[PDB]
Design a protein around this ligand. Sequence first.
Ligand SMILES: Nc1nc2c(ncn2[C@@H]2O[C@H](COP(=O)(O)OP(=O)(O)O)[C@@H](O)[C@H]2O)c(=O)[nH]1
Ligand SMILES: [Mg+2]
Lengths: 168, 92
Amino acid sequence: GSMTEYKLVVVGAGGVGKSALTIQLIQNHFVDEYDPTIEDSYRKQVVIDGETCLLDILDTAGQEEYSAMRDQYMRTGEGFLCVFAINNTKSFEDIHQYREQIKRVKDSDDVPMVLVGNKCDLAARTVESRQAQDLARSYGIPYIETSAKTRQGVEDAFYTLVREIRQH
Amino acid sequence: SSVPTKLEVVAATPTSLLISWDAPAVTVDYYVITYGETGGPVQKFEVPGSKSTATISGLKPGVDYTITVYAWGWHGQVYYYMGSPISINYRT
Ligand SMILES: Nc1nc2c(ncn2[C@@H]2O[C@H](COP(=O)(O)OP(=O)(O)O)[C@@H](O)[C@H]2O)c(=O)[nH]1
Ligand SMILES: [Mg+2]
């Protein structure tokens, strides 16, 4: 439509909280269910730095990693949240392949992207902030620690990505 | 506002520069320094946030360079460079 709209794609290993982050952002509650309904897109009008806009959150949960659908989400997306869980080391190790996939799909070394360390409400993390800080600095992108449970950092993560899209 | 502030070349040789800047009040994790010929890839390195000087070596004499300093640190839950990065132009 005519109202300013940002297409934000959430990627990351299964179980890191892509869907929980999305539902917390848009619907203001925390989901921890065995079999929830996840929408292909969630939209909401917000104000970011004085700008009224629509966010369209495209959650890639449930898609196969190399599926055409996953490719389609990456091609339509304007910016990406690359999410890992701070208590799952494998999910952090997966980040590299997601970033490289997005770069190749966009055919660009510079795609709007943020790194998100989710579940920051949890006690006993396995990925220290330092490791993620150094990774984000090497990528030249923002890093945000978030909790889909408490909402800590959640707006920061998505709004920081909008700011990256703007300056692209 | 620029972060850091007052970036300047304080000493030089035909192939090298010593740069200095003024740290902000906030805690900086690392400063990332980039430099490239103003007639355009950029080279990059970093120094810890406890330091506010750097040297740049291996430059071409008589060539204009664009030098930019980025102050990476926390702002609440967001870790990124803070404020607006500061840049100067300089020719040895
Ligand atoms: N404590 C905590 N649990 C979370 C957080 N985000 C997600 N979860 C839980 O992690 C599990 C997987 O989350 P989900 O959103 O389904 O992950 P997805 O596969 O990446 O979409 C669920 O049990 C969520 O309730 C968080 O920030 N904190
Ligand atoms: Mg899941």
